[PDB]
């Protein structure tokens, strides 16, 4: 039907406020939920309904700063939340040593991203520490882990690393040559990109791979025209009405962004069918509470609410800002970032 | 030991064994953002977890506490890491931990932390004996579980267990020839064993796929596999393929077949073939068939493809 914009604004507002104990499994990823809500409001041009200063302090309280002795550089970045019990400190005093306090690549990413969206200038971000922590996460094969203590490694984190380097406008945070190698090796026989070499190509990893290359400004340089054509084919074949993440899998609202954004980066999203996509996305809209779900007549959540909106954005929905398909923030915010980078260069 | 839902469950704040520890609360400052509300029990377990964690206490009581923390939230990666630290410090029976994680994963098969934990255990034990069967069970609740397939490929690669995978693949493809994950697994096995350069194998595979296509003509997965194993050798380098497909067109037609044909023709144009101008028309004719009636949803895409062939070979 139609886009219930105001309903979605209230939805995101509520998310920033309180969440039901049934979201406990997102505790360590609260910063990404904040991102979905904040970037979501930004996309609806409603950031005014929140206190940017309060939230900015909260975000900075999640930064793992280097200690006096700077012996924890390899562990700097951002925490997903305050779950470790470290005393609230909005990046004011120096780091308070803790055996298990370290950043999480997806949190450093969404954290910096949130700060930019809220208008902060990142002056309180220990850029060098973050970059040091990032470097520490990269593996021999070019991919990344989420935390220094160890975790699984795949394309998801390669994308996070890329976003971090891009926002801090400093690629010393990674060995780009190795990362690119990892991205190439993930291409499947069916031409999509998988989480890693040999794995099944997937819309999520394809986005992460392509977006990472675009952020490094090496898409053209890494893949040949013939290769890009094959990738484009794989991507555009994902549209059924809405988009699915893998051949023969049911469509899911969030893929309207994952795949849609990839198609946009590959400059062929324009050749997709907008109406069927828009119709599907809206069919998952919760007209009562707001937000979107992965499927119609399903419960909504921050992630699908955000990606459904970005999906609509890709098609320039009336009332939704243009989303930067590679950085996953509004173009308006991406622009403010360009200014930030310029200002630094002085 | 004492289950979280046991009638005799007791908060840690009320346990004698924990009297010496001051629980550490979580604080999100003056204005909490995206705050999750927690029950008395929940906050109790984690307030003590923070305490133990903060003091890096490698105790047996800490180990038991992680079990509760994990039952409350198996997505807390820090809890799992600490539990691994404890598994080592207390030299716990890893075979027992395997049973534990096996149960956990069955209840939460889409959790990243639990699969990572199991992989670490298997690395420690250097024992993959349970893996293939375990994964097969998980794949029974969801044959497309990305975590399961990822774990399965790691095990097979790490301990070189290729011997029976191709057979496992054949079995699953019979259960559901549309499972894209299985087709990927098939390519995984073959390319990591015999490879496709052996013309005997390539023929066996191309033949196998055509058979599956004949059973279910409308299956992107099968078509992607077929094109996948031939696209790099050169689709036009297989004259009998072009005709065998043109013969299917009548009955077993699908947008996948038409697209394949278009790709064949394009490969020909790419290799300065005979009748350049004629081939290009055969392609364009198909691109339009796709746009106008075969794969309408991609109408604009196909037209765009056509225009591309036009300005590339004229």
């Amino acid at each position: 039907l139609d886009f219930l914009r105001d309903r979605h604004v209230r939805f995101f507002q509520r998310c920033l406020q309180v969440l039901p104990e049934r979201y406990s499994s997102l505790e360590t990823s609260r910063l990404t939920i904040a991102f979905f809500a904040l970037s979501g409001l930004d996309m609806l041009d409603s950031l005014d309904v929140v206190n940017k200063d309060d939230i900015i302090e909260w975000i900075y309280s999640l930064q793992v700063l280097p200690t006096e002795d700077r012996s924890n550089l390899d562990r700097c970045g951002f925490r997903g939340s305050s779950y470790l019990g470290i005393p609230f400190n909005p990046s004011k005093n120096p780091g308070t040593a803790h055996p298990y306090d370290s950043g999480h690549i997806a949190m450093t990413y969404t954290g910096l991203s949130c700060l930019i969206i809220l208008g902060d200038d990142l002056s309180r971000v220990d850029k060098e520490a973050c970059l040091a922590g990032l470097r520490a996460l990269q593996l021999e094969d070019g991919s990344f882990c989420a935390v220094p203590e160890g975790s699984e490694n795949d394309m998801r984190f390669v994308y996070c690393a890329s976003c971090i380097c891009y926002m801090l406008n400093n690629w010393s945070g990674m060995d780009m040559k190795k990362a690119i190698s990892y991205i190439r090796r993930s291409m499947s026989y069916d031409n999509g990109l998988a989480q890693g070499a040999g794995l099944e190509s997937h819309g999520g990893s394809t986005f992460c791979g392509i977006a990472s290359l675009c952020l490094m400004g090496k898409l053209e340089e890494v893949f040949s025209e013939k290769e890009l054509n094959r990738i484009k084919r794989w991507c555009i074949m994902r549209q059924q009405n809405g988009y699915h993440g893998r051949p023969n899998k049911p469509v899911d609202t969030c893929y309207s962004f994952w795949v849609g954004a990839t198609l946009k980066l590959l400059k062929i999203f324009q050749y997709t069918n907008f109406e069927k996509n828009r119709n599907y996305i809206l069919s998952t809209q919760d007209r009562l509470v707001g937000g979107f779900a992965k499927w119609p007549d399903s419960h909504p959540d921050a992630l699908h609410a955000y990606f459904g909106i970005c999906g609509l954005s890709l098609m320039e929905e009336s009332g939704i800002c243009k989303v930067h398909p590679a950085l996953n923030v509004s173009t308006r915010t991406s622009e403010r970032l360009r200014d930030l980078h310029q200002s630094w260069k002085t | 030991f004492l289950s979280l839902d046991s009638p005799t469950y007791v908060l840690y704040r009320d346990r004698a064994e924990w009297a010496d520890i001051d629980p550490v609360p979580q604080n999100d400052g003056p204005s909490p953002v995206v705050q999750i509300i927690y029950s008395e029990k929940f906050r109790d377990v984690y307030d003590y977890f923070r305490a133990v964690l903060q003091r890096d206490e490698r105790s047996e009581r800490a180990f038991k506490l992680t079990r509760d923390a994990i039952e409350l939230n198996a997505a807390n990666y820090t809890v799992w890491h600490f539990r691994r630290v404890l598994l080592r410090s207390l030299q716990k029976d890893l075979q027992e931990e395997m049973n534990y994680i096996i149960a956990i994963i069955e209840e939460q098969p889409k959790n990243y932390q639990v699969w990572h934990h199991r992989r670490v255990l298997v690395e420690w034990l250097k024992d993959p004996s349970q893996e293939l069967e375990f994964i097969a069970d998980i794949l029974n609740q969801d044959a497309k579980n990305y975590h399961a397939w990822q774990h399965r490929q790691w095990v097979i690669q790490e301990f070189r267990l290729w011997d029976n995978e191709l057979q496992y693949v054949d079995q699953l493809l019979k259960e559901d020839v549309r499972n894209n994950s299985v087709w990927n697994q098939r390519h995984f096995v073959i390319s990591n064993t015999t490879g496709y350069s052996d013309r005997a194998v390539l023929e066996r595979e191309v033949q196998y796929t055509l058979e599956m296509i004949k059973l279910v003509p409308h299956n992107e997965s099968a078509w992607n596999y077929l094109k996948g194993i031939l696209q790099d050798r050169g689709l036009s380098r297989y004259p009998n393929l072009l005709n065998q497909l043109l013969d299917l067109q009548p009955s077993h037609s699908s947008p996948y077949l038409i697209a394949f044909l278009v790709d064949i023709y394009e490969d020909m144009l790419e290799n300065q073939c005979d009748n350049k101008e004629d081939i290009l028309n055969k392609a364009l004719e198909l691109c339009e068939i796709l746009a106008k009636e075969k794969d309408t949803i991609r109408k604009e895409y196909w037209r765009y493809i056509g225009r591309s062939l036009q300005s590339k070979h004229s």
């Binding site: 990823s29 990404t32 899911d252 779900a293 992630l303 | 889409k110 959790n111």
Partner: peptide, 5 residues
Amino acid sequence: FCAIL
């Protein structure tokens, strides 16, 4: 729903 972490 989708646990991406």
